[PDB]
Assembly symmetry: none
Homo-oligomer: 150 residues x 6
């Protein structure tokens, strides 16, 4: 029962220069490194939206569309897509620039939950979509939400 | 332990939750757990393929419970199914507290990783087939084939 | 966006201050901020030169304020001036708490890079062409700082 | 303090040799191996004591063979002997190539760590006794008592 | 070695250039060097203040020469001057090859770091004064005062 | 300072104990200390051999005392003895508190043994260490002692 918010309000991103400690013995980035970055972004989004303690409930469908080489800059951007009563869905996209041309590297839907200081699960501020796509993405989210419950 | 069997690649990892793993409250970031899970899966994949490997997808990462400062978590992984060009690996995370048995060991997270094998040039390679031997290995393999087909759809 | 303009190479980087970035109290080591600044500068240089680049000098690194655990820091760089063989890049670091009160300026510096051939020799550099008011002004101030530095590495 | 068994605390760890683990040639710094060994031993000690622990000594670290880029190394530890206030843990390091070569899994390193248990105030605590069960566990315990006595001497 | 003297806090650091320190060609990123320099400066500051310290500014970082793979670099720092609330530390970086011999130790970089001491609350504290003893210590102190005054002007 | 003498290779390293170095209580993982010690020993070995080097054995790592958050630790190494194909280096770790002062104390120590390798990976003869002072001759002697015993221990009866 707190105050609603918009996707622009919490929209967040993050830009990382693939360094050598990010990489496999060949030239590529461990999926773990990518996944951790994606979690960090989603967590920031969630935090902005709830202004509270948050935890990951589930991540569903992490897709690696392409490899990431040493010396790319990766942009990880997250935005809220749907809220239920007690949970938030956040879409995280990863793109890559070499420094070959900018491409989509990974994606995922994180699901977060808001916790009190005692550790109980809280009602979550509702997401209010405004544009066409925000209503569409919200709808698709409600869809993915229902199936996961099933 | 024969090659191409689950026992051959089965791998696990133990990690003492330290302070740099934690949120401002007592709990471990999902990203930390996820990273450790991918490390094990990749080790499994590498042992099985003896080649370069990359993550293709991770599906259904479930966090069954929080992990607090001073747990030891065990992340273990094992191959479940192979298609022609892809490997599915199941990763499980369990947690022991290390100060008090108010309760004991519990299941904290789980996921199915899917890896792919690459040549030096970077092309996708046929993958050594997994041969199940026990009851559960045949069952898990079957379930794997199931999850594989749906993902294609 | 035309090549050799500042917009062409303008680059930024966003980093979540994590625990390994920090001192035993709550704050980020200057070394960490300095490294991130260099990475951004380097990327700007590389975009503009399309070549191998190295830092020649960094001058005036100023830490305007401390950075906490759990800030996101934006590090942005842009080209300010070019001489014949050298590029000056301005790097700014801003910080947002996620923990909300007010984004602030945390650090700043002028990096000077030099473009290198495959053999490792210092090459003529593509000239920067300013377009807006501020770009001409910043270029002028750059020429200024460039001249003074050359005076600094000699006697009387 | 209730006694316990080797299987209870037995712990192991698997690590893919990455590039930041390596010398300028192909090989892993002893320090990296040493640090992974200490991590496992400490986890073993912790499981057994359920208390704060610190290393008291490590004796006889032997590097039987080099470890190259792209091995997976398994470091495994198990308790071997306990005195009244100290625990001896054996750590073994094995290596599998994950690259394709004619060359099997091999023993890379080994050591005996000695840990001690501390109270919250920081005093040295009596330690849960290790109770061996199999042939080898009694043998390894015996050997441990041997190594323990000599260390007390060589320290006189 | 008396407290508040330069010898008291003088600190150095030795680092083997590894492969994760390097550019795609053979050379060390300036960022790496800069971070190592800040670490040594910080330690010097800490030893002198026995308090929490942060970097206020770094001025004039000069890269005199490239550092390739397989050098050992020595980064050493010492206090040069103190004002009432700030400390100036000089950091010098030297490099030894460990590869082909016909290569003599050389000066690779240098800088003056300026640190400030903070209380737990985060307020700026008066700083213990540096007391020079030798010729050069008085000279370096003087030059410091000089650089300090100019920096106040550049902004005033 | 002549090559192949202990002064030539003597090396040291200073580290500010940070929070990622630390146990959940205030203390530094032995692994962290051990790694720093190996780094120093390796640098000493490298300086003396001007070649590729690897750790053969570390013997008798002693932890004389705990190290907590906000110490600066000095790890210093120096060569003590050489055989024909191996080098012994002594590493000592001291700790200064950097907060309200507990003075400086000895925290750990060890003898590392390194070996020099060619590009092919074969074990090379090693430049001999020439002691000059009293202690350098004494430490060299004690080194020869420790070397002989290790060859025995690792041999049978």
């Amino acid at each position: 029962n707190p105050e609603p918010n918009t996707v622009s309000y919490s929209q967040s991103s993050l830009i990382h220069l693939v360094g050598p400690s990010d990489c496999t013995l060949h030239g590529f980035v461990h999926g773990g490194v990518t996944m951790k970055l994606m979690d960090e972004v989603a967590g920031i989004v969630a935090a902005r939206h709830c202004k509270t303690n948050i935890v990951t409930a589930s991540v569903d469908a992490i897709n690696f569309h392409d490899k990431i080489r040493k010396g790319c800059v990766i942009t990880i951007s997250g935005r809220m897509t749907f809220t239920s009563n007690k949970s938030m869905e956040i879409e995280v996209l990863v793109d890559a620039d070499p420094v070959q041309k900018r491409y989509r590297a990974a994606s995922a839907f994180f699901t977060y939950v808001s916790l009190s200081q005692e550790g109980r699960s809280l009602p979550v501020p509702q997401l209010v979509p405004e544009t066409e796509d925000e209503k569409k993405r919200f709808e698709e989210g409600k869809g993915r939400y229902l199936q996961m419950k099933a």
